[PDB]
Amino acid sequence: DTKEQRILRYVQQNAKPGDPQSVLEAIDTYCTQKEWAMNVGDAKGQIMDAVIREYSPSLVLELGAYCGYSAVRMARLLQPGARLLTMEINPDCAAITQQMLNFAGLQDKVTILNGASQDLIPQLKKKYDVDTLDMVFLDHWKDRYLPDTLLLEKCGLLRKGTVLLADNVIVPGTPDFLAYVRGSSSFECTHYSSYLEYMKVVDGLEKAIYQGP
Ligand SMILES: Nc1ncnc2c1ncn2[C@@H]1O[C@H](CSCC[C@H](N)C(=O)O)[C@@H](O)[C@H]1O
Ligand SMILES: Cc1ncccc1-c1cc(O)c2nc[nH]c(=O)c2c1
Ligand SMILES: [Cl-]
Numbered sequence: 001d002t003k004e005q006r007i008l009r010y011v012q013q014n015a016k017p018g019d020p021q022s023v024l025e026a027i028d029t030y031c032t033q034k035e036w037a038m039n040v041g042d043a044k045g046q047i048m049d050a051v052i053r054e055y056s057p058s059l060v061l062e063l064g065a066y067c068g069y070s071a072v073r074m075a076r077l078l079q080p081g082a083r084l085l086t087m088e089i090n091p092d093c094a095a096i097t098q099q100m101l102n103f104a105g106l107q108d109k110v111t112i113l114n115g116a117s118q119d120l121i122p123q124l125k126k127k128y129d130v131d132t133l134d135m136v137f138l139d140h141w142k143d144r145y146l147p148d149t150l151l152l153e154k155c156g157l158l159r160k161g162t163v164l165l166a167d168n169v170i171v172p173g174t175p176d177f178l179a180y181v182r183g184s185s186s187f188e189c190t191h192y193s194s195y196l197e198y199m200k201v202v203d204g205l206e207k208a209i210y211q212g213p
């Protein structure tokens, strides 16, 4: 088996079906005690939780699903009727994420989109019936953060007040994205210093609120 299959099995055997918090705790435990994995983690996750509660977004887009940790984390805080779309290029991980969501009982709130973000983003309006996004969580691959931000704007998916929340802006680091949003009059940016998941290594989230053209 893979690490990702081992994480899912650990949740299935150490969490309670229908209890998102137990799912997050099981993943955290496994990845602290057994095998590190690139989930956003509890330290940065607590910052995400505070942001989701502040904005109560109706429609969230996540870029990069992995095993579903962040999708569980966000979807558990959504209001009835609110929705999350999560894009995942690796089909093995999409299959893990679906099973994780099902186990957590959050499958009604979350849709997996299979493919590369750069291919799926241009389909969101016509194929997926999206108007604009309330929040975007960028956590796929560092070199896609800036191009996909620009693509979201081109496609008409951002509105005044859309919240972009980007993981890993320190480690691995996203210097072109940070320089761009922090220099742009079209974003209002805040940095939330934290720690790399499961490690005593500094990292951070960036929040960049879109202002309009
Ligand atoms: N262009 C792209 N589009 C979609 N998914 C991508 C991508 N490039 C990488 N990925 C996916 O992005 C993921 C990064 S890890 C995501 C972790 C998750 N947000 C969490 O916190 O639980 C991987 O599963 C990888 O396959
Ligand atoms: C894998 C890794 N090694 C050392 C340091 C950091 C990482 C790391 C951590 C993350 O949170 C990631 N999130 C999304 N996508 C990634 O590529 C990614 C990589
Ligand atoms: Cl952590």
Ligand SMILES: [Mg+2]
Binding pocket: 038, 039, 040, 139, 167, 168
């Ligand atoms: Mg990350």
